[PDB]
A paper describes a structure:
Aerolysin is a major contributor to the pathogenicity of Aeromonas spp, which causes gastroenteritis, deep wound infections and sepsis in humans. It is a pore-forming toxin (PFT), which is secreted by the bacterium as a water-soluble protein, binds receptors on their target cell membrane and, following proteolytic activation, forms circular heptameric oligomers that insert into the plasma membrane thus permeabilizing it, potentially leading to cell death. Aerolysin belongs to the family of β-PFTs, meaning that the final pore spans the membrane in the form of a β-barrel and defines the aerolysin-like family of proteins that share a common structural motif3. Combined, these structures, consistent with the recent lysenin pore structure, describe the major steps involved in the pore-formation process by aerolysin: the transition from the monomer to the oligomer with the formation of two highly stable concentric β-barrels, the zipper-like formation of the β-barrel and the final piston-like puncturing of the lipid bilayer.
While the wild-type aerolysin pore is a membrane-inserted heptamer, a single-point mutant Y221G was found to arrest the protein in its prepore stage. The cryo-EM map of Y221G, shown previously to be a head-to-head dimer of heptamers in solution was here determined at a global resolution of 3.9 Å, extending to 3.0–3.5 Å in most parts of the complex, allowing most bulky side chains to be resolved. Domain 1, which is connected to domain 2 by a long amino-acid stretch, rotates by 180° and moves by 30 Å. Following this movement, all receptor-binding sites become ideally located with respect to the target membrane (D1, D2 and dashed line in Fig. 1c,d). Domains 2 and 3 are mostly unchanged with respect to the soluble structure (1.3 and 3.4 Å root mean squared deviations, respectively). In particular, the prestem loop remains locked in the same curled-up position (yellow loop in Fig. 1e). Upon CTP removal, the β-strands rearrange to form a β-sandwich in the core of which the hydrophobic residues are buried. Furthermore, domain 4 straightens with respect to domain 3 and moves by 20 Å (turquoise domain in Fig. 1e). The high-resolution aerolysin prepore structure, thus reveals an elegant novel fold consisting of two concentric β-barrels held together by interaction of hydrophobic side chains.
Author numbering:
A (entry chain G), B (entry chain A): 1 to 424
The structure:
């Protein structure tokens, strides 16, 4: 070992270490690491062979592992399938109002409602579906409720069965918008004509019988650039980031524009940066004459149609009630209890609300304090649990667009005019 | 003297200063420095010769040292074997989830369970082993308990002996991950094509009858570089360091990237540094003409597949109970007491929890306030205590991987174009 995932084991009944094409003896230590699961796969006084002269006896023997043999055996498996919940393509939401965005998510039956509905069903929630359909997740009503949204089982009309009404409700609560730097795209980039920032004019006077070319005029240092940014459609007010994001090098010019973290995107609509550029002129004015000189400095603006994407998080809540003799809550309650459990879709917050955390720790009995994902596998089949959860946890991503402009270019002229004979 | 280690002494009984091939007279001062141990090696009224006309009388004489002689003697030893607990090769743990890492350690029977089990046994703990084995440390059950792990004696099945059940449990508690700079390794290093950061364009105008080559355009100073780092597999959130770690000079470029101490590795996923590079152009424009000039600045990224190792600490706890007439607790209690003593594996914290501290001070009776390591040597043999403790205290080391990238290269172009005859 090397972790043992319960769902990869089965039972042979053909003799002394049967085994198969892709199946090898579970040893003593391996069994013990998850014997609380293995023992649940056999009858009270059922005895089966483990490996190397060791056997596992059922519940009537307290699950005890001892030396001996049997015709039943746990010669499983081979290089195990350890597929963690697969990732899927991001769900691109057409940059709208914060509310528009949320509305689109809760009404997307093909990517949100049915996937989530099946999750509830698999966990053991009762009545996940409306009175006009025989299928889970169909005939659901979407409605808004305060700061969240509710997907409810459509109790209109008649109904047969223990406890029609009190149908499992899926509530969508908190949202967060995390801007992802690497999603930066842009449209056609424009550029303005060179603008004259400033000039300086001077005269050099050589009132003598020799050139004496020893003098100068210089400009240097700052100099400054302007940065402006717009927000196309509202959402920006709730958009934040956890890292010191900087603007990408579009075209052929890099600007030192850093975006502050933990601030609304809409709160940083511009700024000012500096740079440097010096220029000098050193004339060779001929004897008895004057020469005019100029130093000129130019700008030029560039502009983008920018777009970023932000990851959208969800808080989900599943209302009661748990089905009798058929739910995944680790205690396996049979009192038809009202539940209300929450999940965080996206970033890790704690163990209880993290589907991935729990899924990834299925091999450790001591961590099973919430939902028994091993049970859900045994009931529905590993690959269906993987696909369902993959859809539930896919990465919803919302667009953020606007305009960008900046004084990015610099140019300079140094001009020396013709000599003018004195008088000065 | 020069410390005397009790375990290096024995007793001769052949006459007036017997001695041997590798054995020489213990003198008065030497004996006194550890007479509380030496006296325990003789009967109440047993008398033996020390050296130089001095003898040591047993417990009935209060261990008194006086002038005289005897046929017994303590002519021991020679250049003593003072082997401190040897160090062993680090145990490399395949960079996983914080929990994955811990799980691998507690299930490593060949490097953790049996070594630790023997430690408990040697100290005097009772029942270190399961009901299906006759050997210490075999048939142990591993289970998780809250923030720690428990290794327990497998009380399933029957059992004979005074107090079956209440078997010594080994608990593993706190962990800490200390990143070690010197473990830095990396994979294939990549490098990008030169990217254009910026340019500046200017014109020099010489409207005169002579070249007057006296002017310039310059760029200088900052300039900045970006540093990005990723975290492959979770653990990074708990990884810290006690020193101002800086990144190694990979390839041919040194970057001034300093990692803050006492912060999670995962909290420092990037940064920004600066450097400098200036460029100047000083044209020699011919009479009555113009020349265009450019100054260009370039970047280029490099990237690593990096790996560091972190030392893993442990807090160990050994539950009761101490064996009658056979334990190492310095008072030698015989009331079958429940114990619960803890040890810190790794860094020094105090005397009580430091195995190395205590081992290294065996020669000083006044420091024996916890475990009597001299007793454990007398019972098991020095070399077995050394090997066992070496395994217990070997240095577990966990991997930390991720990606690294940075704007490390710089290049620049200075271009002077061909002259263009006026008009300007």
């Amino acid at each position: 070992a090397e972790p043992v995932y319960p769902d990869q084991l089965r039972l042979f009944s053909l003799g002394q270490g049967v085994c198969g094409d892709k199946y090898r003896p579970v040893n003593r230590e391996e069994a013990q690491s998850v014997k609380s699961n293995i023992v649940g796969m056999m009858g009270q006084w059922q005895i089966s062979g483990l490996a190397n002269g060791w056997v596992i006896m059922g519940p009537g023997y307290n699950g005890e592992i001892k030396p001996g043999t049997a015709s039943n055996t746990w010669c499983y498996p081979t290089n195990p399938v350890t597929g963690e919940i697969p990732t899927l393509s991001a769900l691109d939401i057409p940059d709208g109002d914060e509310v528009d965005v949320q509305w689109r998510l809760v009404h997307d039956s093909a990517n949100f409602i049915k996937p989530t509905s099946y999750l509830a069903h698999y966990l053991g929630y009762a009545w996940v579906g409306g009175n006009h359909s025989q299928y889970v997740g169909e005939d659901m009503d979407v409605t808004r409720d305060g700061d969240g949204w509710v997907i409810r089982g459509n109790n209109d009309g008649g109904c047969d069965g223990y406890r029609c009404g009190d149908k499992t409700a899926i509530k969508v609560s908190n949202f967060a918008y995390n801007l992802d730097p690497d999603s930066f795209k842009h449209g056609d980039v424009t550029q303005s004509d060179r603008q004259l920032v400033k000039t300086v004019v001077g005269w050099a006077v050589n009132d003598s019988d020799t050139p004496q070319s020893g003098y100068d005029v210089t400009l240097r240092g700052d100099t400054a650039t302007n940065w402006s940014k717009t927000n196309t459609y509202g959402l920006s007010e709730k958009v934040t980031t956890k890292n010191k994001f900087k603007w990408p090098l579009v075209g052929e010019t890099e600007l030192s524009i850093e975006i502050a973290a933990n601030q609304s995107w809409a709160s940083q609509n511009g700024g000012s940066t500096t740079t440097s550029l010096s220029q000098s002129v050193r004339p060779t004015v001929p004897a008895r004459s004057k020469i005019p000189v100029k130093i000129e400095l130019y700008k030029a603006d560039i502009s983008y149609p920018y777009e970023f994407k932000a990851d959208v998080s969800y808080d989900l809540t599943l209302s009661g009630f748990l089905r009798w003799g058929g739910n995944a809550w680790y205690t396996h309650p049979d009192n038809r209890p009202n539940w209300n459990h929450t999940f965080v879709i996206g970033p890790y917050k704690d163990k209880a609300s993290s589907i991935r955390y729990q899924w990834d720790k299925r091999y450790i009995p001591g961590e099973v304090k919430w939902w028994d994902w091993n049970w859900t596998i045994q009931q529905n089949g590993l690959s269906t649990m993987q696909n369902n959860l993959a859809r539930v946890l896919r990465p919803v991503r919302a667009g953020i667009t606007g305009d960008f402009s900046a004084e990015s270019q610099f140019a300079g002229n140094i001009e020396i005019g013709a000599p003018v004979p004195l008088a000065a």
